[PDB]
């Protein structure tokens, strides 16, 4: 969700600045005035180098731990096997996955 918002916002910079400039003076705005002000400045039709760099800056580096290969027993925790014995269902999953990917070379 935060990446979605930051993507929405780093396109309508001119509209946001026009809105700030307008609001700082009258200290109040009604919805209609805002809607027309925001319509006056549409987003750019194409992506220039500055716009592309801003959109690349609109990314996050929030680490997501159990993403991809880390969806199985260790879950990307390095120390989990020095603290926990391996559960039973995890052994079962390892067994079925191993038989699947080890009979497929024959299948």
């Amino acid at each position: 969700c935060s990446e979605d918002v930051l993507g929405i916002l780093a396109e309508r910079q001119e509209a946001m600045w026009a809105g700030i400039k307008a609001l700082s003076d009258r200290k109040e705005l009604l919805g209609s005035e805002l809607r027309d002000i925001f319509d006056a400045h549409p987003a750019a039709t194409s992506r220039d180098r500055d716009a592309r760099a801003e959109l690349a800056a609109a990314k996050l580096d929030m680490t997501i731990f159990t993403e991809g290969a880390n969806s199985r027993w260790p879950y990307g925790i390095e120390w989990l096997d020095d603290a926990y014995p391996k559960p039973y269902w995890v052994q079962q999953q390892e067994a079925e996955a191993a038989e699947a990917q080890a009979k497929q070379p024959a299948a």
């Binding site: 600045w17 400039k21 700082s24 801003e54």
Partner: protein, 67 residues
């Protein structure tokens, strides 16, 4: 090497260009009066390379108006 453009310019271009450069520099830097360089280079991450249209200071400047 450095800038080349023409050869050695005349005497009228020198004066009219000095006054023109003064005008453009003033009207360009007008809205950034009274703040530090880090605030500026974080307000204009893409570089201060054209005129600003939305200034909201206490004595606000309009588009292209000089000080």
């Amino acid at each position: 090497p450095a800038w080349r453009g023409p050869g050695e310019v005349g005497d009228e271009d020198k004066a009219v260009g000095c006054l023109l450069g003064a005008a453009v520099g003033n009207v360009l830097a007008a809205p950034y009066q009274g703040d530090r360089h880090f605030e500026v280079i974080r307000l204009r991450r893409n570089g201060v390379t054209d005129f600003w249209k939305y200034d909201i200071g206490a004595q606000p400047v309009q588009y292209g108006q000089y000080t």
